[PDB]
Amino acid sequence: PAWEIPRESIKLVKKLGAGQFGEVWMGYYNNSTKVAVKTLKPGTMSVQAFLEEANLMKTLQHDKLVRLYAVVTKEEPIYIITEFMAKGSLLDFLKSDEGGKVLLPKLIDFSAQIAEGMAYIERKNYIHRDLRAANVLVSESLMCKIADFGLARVIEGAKFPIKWTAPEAINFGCFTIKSNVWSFGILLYEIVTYGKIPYPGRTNADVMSALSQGYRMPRMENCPDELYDIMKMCWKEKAEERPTFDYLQSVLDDFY
Numbered sequence: 001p002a003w004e005i006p007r008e009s010i011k012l013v014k015k016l017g018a019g020q021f022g023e024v025w026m027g028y029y030n031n032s033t034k035v036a037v038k039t040l041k042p043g044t045m046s047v048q049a050f051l052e053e054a055n056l057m058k059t060l061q062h063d064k065l066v067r068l069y070a071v072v073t074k075e076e077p078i079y080i081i082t083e084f085m086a087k088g089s090l091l092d093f094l095k096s097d098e099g100g101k102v103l104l105p106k107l108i109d110f111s112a113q114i115a116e117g118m119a120y121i122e123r124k125n126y127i128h129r130d131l132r133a134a135n136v137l138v139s140e141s142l143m144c145k146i147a148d149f150g151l152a153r154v155i156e157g158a159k160f161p162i163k164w165t166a167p168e169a170i171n172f173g174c175f176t177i178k179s180n181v182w183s184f185g186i187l188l189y190e191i192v193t194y195g196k197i198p199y200p201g202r203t204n205a206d207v208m209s210a211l212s213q214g215y216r217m218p219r220m221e222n223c224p225d226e227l228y229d230i231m232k233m234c235w236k237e238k239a240e241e242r243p244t245f246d247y248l249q250s251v252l253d254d255f256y
C-alpha cells in the first residue's frame, strides 16, 4: 500500500546490532531523514512473519511506540524502516556509563512513559507478550518508546521471555493485557536495578518451579517502598486483581 518504498531511497550507514534473524542499521531516507533499518537475513524465516511485526505497527500508532515509516519488500533483502532511536534499547542504555548516572527522578519517568504506551495498547485492545527493557527504545530527548511487536496479538519464530511472563500465561497459555502488567512489573525491576537480569542466579526452569510455589523477587536494594508496592501489585497471583496500565501511569506520575 502506502508503505512500500523503492530501495534506492534508503542508505544504510552503520550497523547497530546482529541477530540470528537479521541486522539493524542506522541509515537515511533519501538523505534527509535519519531512520533505522531492520534487515532480514534470508532463509531464517518467513519473509512474511518478519513482516508481521511491520504489519502490526501499521495499526499501532502512538507517541510512546516506535513509529514505522516504510518497508522494502520487493528485492531479496527485506527492510523495515522506522523512527530512529538515538540511545538504543532501554536495557543497553541503563547499563552504559551515562545510564548509570541517571537518578530515580528520570527512572520513574521512563517507567511512566512505558506505562503510557501500554495504556494505548490496552485501549486499542492488543497485547504485547514480549514486554521488557530490551524491547523499549530511547531517543536523544530521552523518550522511551515500545518496540518489537513480533509477539503482539489482538486476541511463529518466536520465544516469549520466560522470566518476564506471567504464571497463568506460562502454565495455561493464557496471555492477556493483565499478563503484560506482570511483565511490566518485571520491567520496573529492570529499570530500578539498571538493567540487571531478573531472578539473578536462577535458570528459566528454576524460576518457574518457584513461581508455581508463590515466589516473588524480594524487595531490591535502592528501590523505595512505594515503587516496590507498584511492582508487588503487578505480581498479584490472581490476574484479575492486577492494576490497569492507566492506574500505573497515574500512580507513577505521582512521585514528585
Ligand SMILES: CC(C)(C)n1[nH+]c(-c2ccc(Cl)cc2)c2c(N)ncnc21
Binding pocket: 016, 017, 024, 036, 037, 038, 053, 054, 066, 080, 082, 083, 084, 085, 086, 088, 089, 137, 147, 148
Ligand atoms: C536493537 C537496536 C537497539 C539497535 N534497535 N532496534 C531497533 C528497531 C528497528 C526496527 C524495528 Cl521494526 C524495531 C526496533 C532500533 C531503532 N529503531 N532505533 C535505534 N536502535 C534500534
